[model samples]
Target: VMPKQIVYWKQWLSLRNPILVFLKTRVLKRWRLFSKHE
Candidate 1:
């Protein structure tokens, strides 16, 4: 979770604004996948 936060921050830095929503969707998908796995 912590490490992935850094990855997401980096993604945010790179993508800026237009892709923020897309990144958020990806983040939610990842959370869902991880929670399901656990």
Candidate 2:
């Protein structure tokens, strides 16, 4: 069986990866919108 920490990291990565990508894309999009008006 795998160690507990490794298993936890795997679970964390699966959840964290998508959330981070979504946030990054959102921030970039927001920045673009903000720049257009200034």
Candidate 3:
């Protein structure tokens, strides 16, 4: 039931998740900084 734009959403997640991860490590989260690397 999703539209064509839904495909773009997946791509957006690909970009956003890493930035979110980078922020979790470099900015605020101490636990993630010592957690997994990949």
Candidate 4:
């Protein structure tokens, strides 16, 4: 079974254009790590 977080990520990705989705995913992941330090 898929985890809830993975399921939500897939759903969010499905709503975006392919290239934009890929770029946004990378940016968001980096931001997530940055946010953890603050």
Per-candidate TM-score against the hidden true structure: 0.48, 0.63, 0.47, 0.44
In model 1, state the lDDT of residue 15.
78
lDDT of 1 at 38: 98
The order of the candidates by lDDT, greatest first, is: 2, 1, 4, 3
lDDT by residue (tens digit), candidate 2, 15-34: 89998988888887877877
Where does candidate 2 have its weakest 10-residue lDDT segment? Answer: 28-37
RMSD of 3: 7.1
> Given candidate 3, what's the lDDT at residue 1?
38
- lDDT (10s digit) by residue, model 4, range 1-38: 57987778877776666768678878888789778777
lDDT of each: 0.82, 0.83, 0.72, 0.76
- Screening candidate 2 with a backbone cut-off below 3 angstroms (N, C-alpha, C), the clashing residue pairs are none
lDDT of 3 by residue, 1-38 (tens): 36657768877898899989887767655555545543
Quote the lDDT for 19 in model 2: 86
Cα error of candidate 2 at position 34, Å = 1.6
Screening candidate 4 with a backbone cut-off below 3 angstroms (N, C-alpha, C), the clashing residue pairs are none
Q: Which stretches of candidate 1 lie over 4 Å from their true place?
A: 1-15
